[PDB]
Amino acid sequence: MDFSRFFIDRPIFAAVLSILIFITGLIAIPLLPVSEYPDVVPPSVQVR
Amino acid sequence: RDSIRAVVQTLLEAVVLVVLVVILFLQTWRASIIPLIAVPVSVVGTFSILYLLGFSLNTLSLFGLVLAIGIVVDDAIVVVENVERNIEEGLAPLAAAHQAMREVSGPIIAIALVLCAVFVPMAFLSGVTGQFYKQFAVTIAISTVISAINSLTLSPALAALLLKPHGAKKDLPTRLIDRLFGWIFRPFNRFFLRSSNGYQGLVSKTLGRRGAVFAVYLLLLCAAGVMFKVVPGGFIPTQD
Amino acid sequence: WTDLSFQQATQGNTALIVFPVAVLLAFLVLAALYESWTLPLAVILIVPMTMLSALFGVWLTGGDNNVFVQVGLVVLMGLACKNAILIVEFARELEIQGKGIMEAALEACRLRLRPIVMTSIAFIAGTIPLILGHGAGAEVRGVT
């Protein structure tokens, strides 16, 4: 395939594709919840 | 109910004015029909995606379609205008369609991508303002995408079939249009030529004074940022 | 704050995130498609001219920067770029065909003036019912 050889002649297209991935990741960093572990703790209901 | 009926009537009023403009510029039933096909396809075809996304026929989504009336015809007009110019250059209608579409395929896809790139940030918003943005952005983006697809596929096919070479015999619908509405086209065509030719001289003069033009632009750049402070802020206007 | 005032206070600077991000996204797309860093700059430089023209209409009518004004700005951003793309793309191709910088730009404007005026007037004619709106909902339609 010529997929990789198509980008050697277009450095700006290759650069833009990598930039788009990077900036999108920066946006999502403050949007992610922060916790010690994933949702592994069983939910419990207490009757008193 | 009255508000929704009004925005639907506004949609119909916008179609009539847009259709009139297309006929005024193309001045042929064989040519003006191609942009007019793209209007129902893009507008009505949008509702299929709205159902999938769970949208509603509110007064903003319907309002987004009203603004999209003048946008869906843009891609079809570009194709038809380019094919017609090639015909005036002596090319056959089938050859003109091939020649025009190796020229406008780039910008048509480029314009569609740029429009989508502008509206996709709105789809990620939340809240009252985010929902309001989502109705307009999603509706207009879908209409433009369908219009771009229709212009890339159906517009060249109809152009190579309906359009005829220069100097060909005028059929009865065409000679009919020429006799009731020819008195608009002839003054308009010469008025357009005078405006365009004079505009060409204006560009030639302004290209030698880029320094003066750039200096004026810097003032306008500051003026645009000033006006974001002059106008008071608001959220939602009151209505009767 | 309660009711709509709660929503008005709760919402952030929603214009301050989407407007620069959308401009950045448009700039990156143009650079990728047309293989240049300065060519997209020729297109996005007209976006500030769009806001000045749009905010001039709302200021002349005594309006305010409400939501319906902002959605008009978003629409205008895409259409402003579309007009610029038509001029720039053809001048780029004419230079490849061996024409000079001034010659290609001058020739591209001549051959692309008609589609630009045709589309600009076509959209403008579509906003006449909004400008001359009447009846129910005419206030919000007139604002946009």
Distance separating alpha carbons of residues C95 and B133, to the nearest angstrom: 40
How far lies B166's CA from each of B85, B90, B169, C20, in Å? 10, 8, 9, 48
Alpha carbon B107 to its chain centroid, in Å, reads 14
- Nearest-Cα residue of chain C relative to residue B136: C71
Work out the number of other CB atoms within 10 angstroms of the CB of residue B3: 17
Q: Which of B71, B43, B56 is nearest to B4 (CA)?
A: B56
The C-alpha atoms of residue B162 and residue B93 are separated, in whole angstroms, by 9
How far apart are the C-alpha atoms of B181 and A34, rounded to whole Å?
Answer: 70
List CB contacts of C141: < 8 A, sequence separation 6 or more: B7, B10, B63, C129, C130, C133
**Cβ neighbours around B189 below 10 Å, total:** 12
Identify all chain B residues contacting C29, using CB atoms and an 8 Å cutoff.
110, 113-114, 117
Q: From CA B39, how far away is CA B10, in angstroms rounded?
A: 15
Q: Which residues of C41-78 are buried (b: 16+ CB within 10 A; e: fewer)?
A: ebbbeebbebbbebbeebeeeebebbbbbbbbbbbbbb
- Which chains border B (3 or more CB–CB pairs < 8 Å)? C
Distances (CA, A) of B114 to B28, B146, B217, C32: 31, 15, 24, 11
Measured in whole angstroms, the distance separating CA A22 from the mean position of its chain's CA atoms is 9
Inter-residue contact C112 to C84 (CB < 8 Å)? no
CB B31 within 8 A of CB C139: no
Give the SS3 label for residue B240. Answer: coil
Residues of chain C contacting residue A12, judged by C-beta atoms under 8 Å apart:
31-32, 35-37
Grouping H, G, I as helix, E, B as strand and the rest as coil, residue C65 is: strand
Distance of CA C96 to the CA centre of its chain: 28
Cβ–Cβ < 8 Å for B46, B139 = yes
Q: In Å, how far is C22's CA from the nearest CA of chain A? A: 12
